[PDB]
Write a protein that binds this ligand. Structure first.
Ligand code: B12
Ligand code: B12
Ligand SMILES: Nc1ncnc2c1ncn2[C@@H]1O[C@H](COP(=O)(O)OP(=O)(O)OP(=O)(O)O)[C@@H](O)[C@H]1O
Ligand SMILES: C[C@H]1O[C@@H](n2cnc3c(N)ncnc32)[C@H](O)[C@@H]1O
Ligand SMILES: C[C@H]1O[C@@H](n2cnc3c(N)ncnc32)[C@H](O)[C@@H]1O
Ligand SMILES: [Mg+2]
Ligand SMILES: [Mg+2]
Lengths: 152, 178, 182
């Protein structure tokens, strides 16, 4: 079906964007680079899961992401408004990765609502967007960059 | 719910609604512009300020797209009506750059320095957003000025790409048949 | 002024004079093609040094993608409704792409594994180009199922994805980056 190819291509697109983003880390040894590579592998797993009456998609990564998300929010100031995308090359590419990921979630949702894919796949992509947002904020913080908010 | 989410007026729709594709593509555009902006190394450039104003305006179109006219109460009025001011700004800025650029006579390929390339990418993403917003406008659900703004933003990003290539002294590649 | 405002109400022109809404399948394939070309254009500027052959090949693909856009914007049905010519797409670029694919393929270690997009900035950037190129192919195949666009256009997008993948492996190899596996 053409819906499935669209889901798999958009998940591929997400993974490739994360790959480019990762190439933006200058110093090695950053734990979130390890996390982004684990996410790339999980993304290959959701791409396999989408091609099938639907295959079982392990719920493990969902908890992993949630744990990482709590880890980074614990170090961040409370955010209460919309931020403009910025805050270092890493943070910007991660916000682009975030938006691409939400496009992927929209491409997967019809398949889940039709019974052709495990709901855990959409749940994983939904939480992956929140992880991408919180991580962008954390990278901007660790570089000492503004985090510009607009309101009016 | 999972698979579902809400509009600013309280309508709960499945995550693949026209409005969610619209606001998400508006988000993708704002973020592409964000990376492009992180590519200006030298500070004080006025077009950095312009791209940031555009990011704000885009957050405003995001609110407009998330408030359908068919469900907009009175309190929501200030979001359904999208004043045309930002559009005029774009027109003015384009005129500003056009007086500084050589006359354009051929098809340009995306090129001309990292900023210029990033802006051509942003333009393509902008036109995708325009395609995702037009269905809402032609249905009566979002102010036409939003599509008008995105349509002019495509031309702004194009002339800005050209200006950046000029100021870096990089020469755009021209389309060549065969 | 360079803008006309004839698009301000959501409508636009194909190359046959027809006026369709901006969300039409032809405009979706033309835009996705436009986008792929711009992504290749940005990748083209991660080349550190001068005079790479694959940079010339990419700029050429860009030209060919302009020609793809032109073709896609000329739907065959409106071509016989408007008494226009046939608007063909030649096979030259596909055969060329296949040649370049062979040239790189023959130089890199075989691969049995699924690789993660990575391998340096050029490599990862070309993998992004590859995903976008596939999206273009997916936007074009409905147009050929309906008989509006020559099927060579789809085939060329499909061998362009193969070209970009093998070029990313080739860039990763020449850099000494190793593509990550899992
Ligand atoms: C879904 C799918 C995709 C999805 C998602 C895959 C993912 N998990 O990330 C997307 C769109 C991302 C994709 C991309 C690609 N894929 Co694909 N894909 C498939 C498909 C349908 C199943 C893959 C899968 O998930 N299997 C289950 C998981 C668990 O597989 P796996 O056990 O780990 O092992 C696989 C690989 O080792 C591969 N393998 C086996 N023999 C060979 C030989 C060669 C030369 C290669 C390269 C790989 C390979 O096949 C195994 C089974 O799928 C297969 C077709 C099939 N085999 O039925 C093609 C297939 C594996 N893909 C293929 C290709 C060509 C590619 C791309 C290079 C295409 C491109 N231009 O983008 C890229 C690879 C880049 C990358 N690594 O990201 C070819 C590989 C053979 C070849 N001619 O090179 C296959 C066999 C399709 C075909 N019939 O030609 N793909
Ligand atoms: C449409 C929409 C979007 C659109 C864009 C809207 C825009 N203008 O840019 C898109 C899809 C881009 C989006 C993205 C995000 N959003 Co949103 N979005 C909404 C929605 C449905 C309406 C927003 C709106 O335009 N309101 C009107 C404008 C004028 O309000 P405003 O005065 O400027 O004030 C708003 C902000 O202060 C916001 N706010 C309150 N708490 C928080 C917390 C955070 C972290 C943020 C970013 C904002 C925020 O709430 C106010 C009213 O909406 C609201 C839900 C709702 N309000 O019913 C969710 C909502 C604001 N979004 C939310 C989230 C989580 C996000 C994302 C982080 C999602 C993600 N993981 O990527 C990003 C943030 C992007 C950014 N800041 O750059 C949460 C925020 C609260 C929370 N739980 O943390 C909400 C409340 C939805 C929810 N129940 O989870 N969003
Ligand atoms: N948002 C878009 N996405 C994809 N293709 C488009 C889009 N808008 C226009 N097109 C196609 O590309 C061509 C150039 O678009 P262009 O923006 O120059 O004109 P327009 O938007 O129709 O009118 P205006 O001059 O008011 O912008 C059009 O003739 C049409 O083929
Ligand atoms: C923050 C707001 O974004 C919207 N929203 C929820 N999920 C997605 C998605 N995957 N893509 C785009 N927009 C989404 C909802 O309106 C939510 O309230
Ligand atoms: C690697 C797998 O990708 C699938 N495939 C082929 N073309 C596309 C495309 N444009 N987008 C997404 N998936 C595609 C094939 O079915 C193949 O098995
Ligand atoms: Mg236009
Ligand atoms: Mg024009």
């Amino acid at each position: 079906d053409d819906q499935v190819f669209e889901a798999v291509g958009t998940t591929d697109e997400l993974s490739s964007a994360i790959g480019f983003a990762l190439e933006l880390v200058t110093e090695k040894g950053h734990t979130f680079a390890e996390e982004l590579q684990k996410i790339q592998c999980t993304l290959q797993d959701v791409g396999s899961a989408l091609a099938t009456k639907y295959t079982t998609f392990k719920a493990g990564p969902i908890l992993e992401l949630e744990q990482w998300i709590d880890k980074y929010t614990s170090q961040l100031p409370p955010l209460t408004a919309f931020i403009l995308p910025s805050g270092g090359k890493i943070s910007s590419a991660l916000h682009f990765c975030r938006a691409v990921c939400r496009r992927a979630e929209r491409r997967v949702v019809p398949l889940v609502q039709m019974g052709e894919t495990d709901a855990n796949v959409a749940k994983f992509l939904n939480r992956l967007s929140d992880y991408l947002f919180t991580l962008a904020r954390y990278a901007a913080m660790k570089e000492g960059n503004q985090e510009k908010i607009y309101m009016k």
